[PDB]
């Protein structure tokens, strides 16, 4: 009793000791269910031996473990509440979640943690059947506890356990009694294991995964591994099943392994226990290896996820079943040959993405519905691989990836980003036991899943000897999967794959000890033969993914560039509520959390509620599995599939003058893997009317699949066909001049030019005004996250684009009128103006404009702009005004329908687009410049029409308000409609969000610019 | 504070039957150090005044199992303890027999548990510390080799635990020592989970 | 040599192939390397003795190669030519006669050198068992050592007898071996394999 008390148990401070990572914890193993019926195991029915303890628990929060009273161990405290398990206790208001990127959330003094260590006390009162306690073994399984815990059953201390992302199991057979039982779990927020868990994510705690009880017989299956081997052409396979038992060996014990393909048995084997001779001392008596021959096996791949069911039976010679386990088996071979990563003898192209386990409401608690939604969206957007972001995932995730067909990179829960010099722990032999536990337990748990093709040793922990040791351990235990690791320069001896983070396509980044070469250069460095797969690239912070097409051109051109994983899938934003109870999305610092990294927690391609960002369509287009070539008038279609024929594919084509369609047709796709099909279009129409002809093709899946609905569009492409230049030709407007204004009349329209300012100040139709703000030049945009580019909240950068623009005075430049002159032509009125934008006597830009109002009511605007060569290149060159009208729809002829930028427009298609005004605004959580549409020839707002070749955005929010507002929920619509029309716009970048990344050719670096606009 | 230093609490967590716990509060390994305060002495490898040998006469008592040790041993020397020279193997003094086995383990094979009849040697030394040592700096005790696992007490307070028998174990004693007379108590166990990795063809002592 | 030997396990690698024992083995290796890495006389690290071959051995071999690349690492485990050794280091391999055992054959050292794909040097970690009146055939080993460049010698087993002193009723000392102390199952006189007596008096074989 005295040794079960809190005073004794807490005295040794096991959570401040890297040498003690657990106490009385059972060995790791693949998932078990302990079926007592072979049919139930084969069909994967729920097992009566596996009981879920998820539900209602009693919870009490304490500021430190010492504050817990001794009465909690025997009876529930009066102040304990009832909460749902699994859950994070930060999502119930007990203490704040903390978002920190690199800096540790506690003072750096390993292995010690602060004395103010928040503590969560969970207790559950439950009942156990007498048959469970009569025989066999009863264990409790904690799928995940953050970050360390002590366990009591009926007042007796059981065990400890540390690692937060892997299951902990304890034997409860000696502690349970018939009838009512009570479990007490003390969960600590910080421990010495927290030093290895410095990932860029919200820091939470609690029992955040499932809790269950498993009953097994005394003679039991303790472990089983499956392995598949093949011949040269994969016509013959051998299934290798090694089974280990626990308990007492008896001569009558047998093991049967049967392989089932859906409903028919394809192979089976039976043997007594006792393995082959291992060494001078003999072999394993408690192990048996079963070999099964499979003829013409169906192979597993992301394209076609063929699965078998393997059932392992422990039974007597007379035929009495003792216990059965089962797993899904996929026949596939992953290996690196001659510098290429091959799956089933074919080189892979990885269309991957990094995915954190995050839910905006439940925090880091994962459920099947959210996982399935994520997988469906990823497959619908042409992703075929996922990287478990820096920790092992929920066990069901791998089963779902097996079933739906995604390749998986499984990562050990090790990240020491906050150390200086970042390998302080991973080069220290005293931390080798803890790291080894984190690696070996993950490999033991997950080695049977076919979807897992690559092991990863962790993330951002430098390079230490511990990494080399664990790499060699994995290569010894599981040689069927390559091992990768990025830390310490991405090409060290602890990785089979060069896996850089945010390496650029063509530009080198020479950091002193760990340079980031361009990937093309990296491939050919002397002595380098490994394949290159980027573990993180195209940082998707906010309005981003500029330059993605360059990465994918490089991927397709170079054989040893086998793709990469985008960072990342989903924003890590949390939901808060205002005084009215209206929810809004929150990021770092919104909970009063200790030093934070603000909006750097939102880097996703989809919103926290799984609503797509515009960049997702660019990703889908660049990753598509069909590539198109047009050589008039033949479309050549090339399949990038490695294994599957195009049997669910239909090619639609269409030719339009403006859209305004002219012709269309449908051709079924019949192309072999990596094959080619020539499609001959019928005689295309040749209209005599002026305009550009466009050919658009789309590949449509007519039949539904497990992951998509009938009619799903999987790939598309567009081309220009033939242009007919317009060669045709088209009352006198009255000019009235006063010392304050130039005022022009034509019938029922009036234009007013303010002679003091030199801008068009008002326009009339009838008696109603059209402008709330004059038409003026604009050279700035509300800064994107890529423009701000300051990774740590405290590390200011003078090289960021926003800092250069601020220092040069681009946001404060004042326009000085240089000329304002009006002339009356024979059939038109000519207005000439000139302005100079200056900051402390330095002329930044000069604008010269001519306004020509003709007898047809149209106003033709010509703009010429000179930019000083020594000022930073401006974000945009264009015009800006606030219109009085608020219309419901926006109709334009240009690129669309989604938001697109000069850096990010390969997925948009030229056509006639119509959308509600609300669809013209992209609600990024951190407000910024958004909603641009490039390549626009005509724009129709309510009464107005603009024609030319320009980029535009149109919304209810001015650029100033977007600049000054930190959350999208604090934006308020303005009185009218703000319109920005740009002749030219800078790229958005996106190679990373902490350094300038807009290529030189998408910068506005030309000295002079010209554009033309007609307003009718 | 006293209840957690007692034999009942310390021995309740059978650290010698646990492969996960190979030490407690042991310092990091390092090349041999002498802490010379003069460069000439270090160069000529003279004896250093900062490195003091505790070899000599200790008090020893043999027990058949760790549970048989009385609680009074932690505060004062037992009346039945003898005086023996250290370093030494207690099999060479007749307390129990040495065992020569080539391959077969000297205990029943069931890793990591060891037999309950686990012979136990209780060493105690009463010594004196200069005040200048306790005024500043750090004082550590170095056990070059202990077979096969041991718990350490200084002045009745539990210090640490160590297993590997052929490598030095070092513990920080700065917070445990007092001016004048001090007493160390060392409980040495013959068998531990580390014995499973020490099956060499030699006399087991 | 690290203080690791699990000769008595069945199979010999039951502990060394188990990840749960990796922390203890790692301590035994890393602490020895940390203590002794500055000594010039130490030219080779050894991972232990007679513990089979497990993944823990491969891990610790790679750790040593990472931390101290200035010394080769050897290990006689499951077959003496595994991936955890830089030197083929068989135990009691004979000069000209093969000893085919299942899964761990003891080839003759001359044959061992030329097996397909084998390029490492061969140094016997134990040879010429010097039990009592022994060391017959020693000259054959040394002829082989001098003839073959890649046969770089070996370590004789062993230096000194492990006999203990007991006393009779007259108080006259006498040398004792296994079983003379009433010890639980013992291996009799196999503790005396030395070239010299326990008091360092030479045997004729020296
Ligand atoms: Mg710990
Ligand atoms: Mg990081
Ligand atoms: Mg232990
Ligand atoms: Mg031996
Ligand atoms: Na490629
Ligand atoms: Na981030
Ligand atoms: Na030679
Ligand atoms: Na011997």
From Swiss-Prot, chain C:
GO biological process, one term: lactose catabolic process
Residues that hold Mg(2+) 1 according to the record: 5, 7, 50
Residues of the whole record sequence present: 413 to 618 of 1024
Induction, per UniProt: By allolactose.
Family of the protein in this entry: Belongs to the glycosyl hydrolase 2 family.
Keyword hit for Iron-sulfur: no
A GO term from the CC aspect: beta-galactosidase complex
Highest rank taxon of the organism: Bacteria
Binding site for substrate: 50, 126-129, 193
Name by which UniProt lists this protein: Beta-galactosidase
Effect noted on mutating residue 126 to Q: 10000-fold decrease in the beta-galactosidase activity
Active site: 50 (proton donor), 126 (nucleophile)
Amino-acid positions noted as binding Mg(2+) 2 in the UniProt annotation, renumbered to this chain: 186
Keyword annotations of the record: Glycosidase, Hydrolase, Magnesium, Manganese, Metal-binding, Sodium
Binding site for Na(+): 190, 193
Native organism: Escherichia coli (strain K12)
Assembly with partners or alone: Homotetramer.
Name of encoding gene: lacZ
GO molecular function, one term: magnesium ion binding
């Amino acid at each position: 009793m005295i040794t079960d008390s809190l005073a004794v148990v807490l005295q040794r401070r096991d959570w401040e000791n890297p040498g003690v990572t657990q106490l009385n914890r059972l060995a790791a193993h693949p998932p078990f269910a302990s079926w007592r019926n072979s049919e139930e195991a084969r069909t994967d029915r729920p097992s009566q031996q596996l009981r879920s303890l998820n539900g209602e628990w009693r919870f009490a929060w304490f500021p430190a473990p010492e504050a817990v009273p001794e009465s909690w161990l025997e009876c529930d405290l009066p102040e304990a509440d009832t909460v749902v398990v699994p859950s994070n206790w930060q999502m119930h208001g007990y203490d704040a979640p903390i978002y920190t990127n690199v800096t540790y959330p506690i003072t750096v003094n390993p292995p010690f943690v602060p004395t103010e260590n928040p503590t969560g006390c969970y207790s559950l009162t439950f009942n156990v059947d007498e048959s469970w306690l009569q025989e066999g073994q009863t264990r409790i399984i904690f799928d995940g506890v953050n970050s360390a815990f002590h366990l009591w059953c009926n007042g007796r201390w059981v065990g400890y356990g540390q690692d937060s992302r892997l299951p902990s199991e304890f034997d409860l057979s000696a502690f349970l009694r018939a009838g009512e039982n009570r479990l007490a779990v003390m969960v600590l927020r910080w421990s010495d294991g927290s030093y290895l868990e410095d990932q860029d994510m919200w820091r939470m705690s609690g029992i955040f995964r499932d809790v269950s009880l498993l009953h097994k017989p005394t003679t039991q299956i303790s472990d089983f591994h499956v392995a598949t081997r093949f011949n040269d052409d994969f016509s013959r396979a051998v299934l290798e099943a090694e089974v280990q038992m626990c308990g007492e060996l008896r001569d009558y014990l047998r093991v049967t392994v049967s392989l089932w393909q859906g409903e028919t048995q394809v192979a089976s084997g039976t043997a007594p226990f006792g393995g082959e001779i291992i060494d001078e001392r003999g072999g394993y008596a408690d192990r048996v290896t079963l070999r099964l021959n499979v003829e013409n096996p169906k192979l597993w791949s992301a394209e076609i996820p063929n699965l078998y069911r393997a059932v392992v039976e422990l039974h007597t010679a007379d035929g009495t079943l003792i216990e059965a386990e089962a797993c899904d088996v996929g026949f596939r071979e992953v290996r690196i040959e001659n510098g290429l990563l091959l799956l089933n003898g074919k080189p892979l192209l990885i269309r991957g993405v990094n995915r954190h386990e995050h839910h905006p409401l439940h925090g880091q608690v994962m459920d099947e519905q959210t996982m399935v939604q994520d997988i469906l969206l990823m497959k619908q957007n042409n992703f075929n691989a996922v990287r478990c972001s820096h920790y092992p995932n929920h066990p069901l995730w791998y089963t779902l990836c097996d079933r739906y067909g995604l390749y998986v990179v499984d990562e050990a829960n090790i990240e020491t980003h906050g150390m200086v010099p970042m390998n302080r722990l991973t080069d220290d032999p005293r931390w080798l036991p803890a790291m080894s536990e984190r690696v070996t337990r993950m490999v033991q748990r997950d080695r049977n899943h076919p979807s897992v093709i690559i092991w990863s040793l962790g993330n951002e922990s430098g390079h230490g000897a511990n990494h080399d040791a664990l790499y060699r351990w994995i290569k010894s235990v599981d040689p069927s999967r390559p091992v990768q690791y990025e830390g310490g320069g991405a090409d060290t001896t602890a990785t089979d794959i060069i896996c850089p983070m945010y390496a650029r396509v063509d530009e080198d980044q020479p950091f002193p000890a760990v340079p980031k070469w361009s990937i093309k250069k990296w491939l050919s460095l002397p002595g380098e033969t490994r394949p290159l797969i980027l573990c993180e690239y195209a940082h998707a912070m906010g309005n981003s993914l500029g330059g993605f097409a360059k990465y994918w051109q490089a991927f397709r051109q170079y054989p040893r560039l086998q793709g990469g994983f985008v960072w990342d899938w989903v924003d890590q934003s949390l939901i808060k509520y205002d005084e009215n109870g209206n929810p809004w999305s929150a990021y770092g610092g919104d909970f009063g959390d200790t030093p934070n990294d603000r909006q750097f927690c939102m880097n996703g391609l989809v919103f926290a509620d799984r609503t797509p960002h515009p960049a997702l369509t660019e990703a889908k287009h660049q990753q598509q599995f069909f590539q198109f070539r047009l050589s008039g008038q033949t479309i050549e279609v090339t399949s990038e599939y490695l294994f599957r024929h195009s049997d669910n594919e239909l090619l639609h084509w269409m030719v339009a003058l403006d859209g305004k369609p002219l012709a269309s047709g449908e051709v079924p796709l019949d192309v072999a893997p990596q094959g080619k099909q020539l499609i001959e279009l019928p005689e295309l129409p040749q209209p005599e009317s002026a305009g550009q002809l466009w050919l658009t093709v789309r590949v449509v899946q007519p039949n539904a699949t497990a992951w998509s609905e009938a009619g799903h569009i999987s790939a598309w492409q567009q081309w220009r066909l033939a242009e007919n230049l317009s060669v045709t030709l088209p009352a006198i407007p009255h000019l009235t001049t006063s010392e304050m204004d130039f005022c022009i009349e034509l019938g029922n329209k009036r234009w007013q030019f303010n002679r003091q300012s030199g801008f068009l100040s008002q326009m009339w139709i009838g008696d109603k005004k059209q402008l709330l703000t004059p038409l003026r030049d604009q050279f700035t945009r509300a800064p994107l996250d890529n423009d701000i580019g300051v990774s740590e909240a405290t590390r200011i950068d003078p090289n960021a684009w926003v800092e250069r623009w601020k220092a040069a005075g681009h946001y404060q430049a004042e326009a000085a009128l240089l000329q304002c002159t009006a002339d009356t032509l024979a059939d038109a009125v000519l207005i000439t103006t000139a302005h100079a934008w200056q900051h402390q006597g330095k002329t930044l830009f000069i604008s010269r404009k001519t306004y020509r109002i003709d007898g047809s009511g149209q106003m033709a605007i010509t703009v010429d702009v000179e930019v000083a060569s020594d000022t930073p290149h401006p974000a945009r060159i264009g015009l800006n005004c606030q219109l009085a009208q608020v219309a419901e729809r926006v109709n334009w002829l240009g690129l669309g329908p989604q938001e697109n930028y000069p850096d990010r427009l390969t997925a948009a298609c030229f056509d006639r687009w119509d959308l509600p005004l609300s669809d013209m605004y992209t609600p990024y959580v951190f407000p910024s410049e958004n909603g641009l549409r490039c390549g626009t020839r005509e724009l129709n707002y309510g009464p107005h029409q603009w024609r030319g070749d320009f980029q535009f955005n149109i919304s209810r929010y001015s650029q100033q308000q977007l600049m000054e507002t930190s959350h999208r929920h604090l934006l308020h619509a303005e009185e009218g409609t703000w319109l920005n029309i740009d002749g030219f716009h800078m790229g958005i970048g996106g190679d990373d969000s902490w350094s300038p990344s807009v290529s030189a050719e998408l910068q506005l670096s030309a000295g002079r610019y010209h554009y033309q606009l007609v307003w009718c | 504070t006293m209840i957690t230093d007692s034999l009942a609490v310390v021995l309740q967590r059978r650290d010698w039957e646990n492969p996960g716990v190979t030490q407690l509060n042991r310092l990091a390994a390092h090349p041999p150090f002498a802490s010379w305060r003069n460069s000439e002495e270090a160069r000529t490898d003279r004896p250093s005044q900062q490195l003091r040998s505790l070899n000599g006469e200790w008090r020893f008592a043999w027990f058949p199992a760790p549970e048989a040790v009385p609680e009074s041993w932690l505060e004062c020397d037992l009346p039945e303890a003898d005086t023996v020279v250290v370093p030494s193997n207690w099999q060479m003094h007749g307390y129990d027999a040495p065992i020569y086995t080539n391959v077969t383990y000297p205990i029943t094979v069931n890793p990591p548990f060891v037999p309950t009849e686990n012979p136990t040697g209780c060493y105690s030394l009463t010594f004196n510390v200069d005040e200048s040592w306790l005024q500043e700096g750090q004082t550590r005790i170095i056990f070059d080799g202990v077979n096969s696992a041991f718990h350490l007490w200084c002045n009745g307070r539990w210090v640490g635990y160590g297993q590997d028998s052929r490598l030095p174990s070092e513990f920080d004693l700065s917070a445990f020592l007092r001016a004048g007379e001090n007493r160390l108590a060392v409980m040495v166990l013959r068998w531990s989970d580390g014995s499973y990795l020490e099956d060499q063809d030699m006399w087991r002592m």
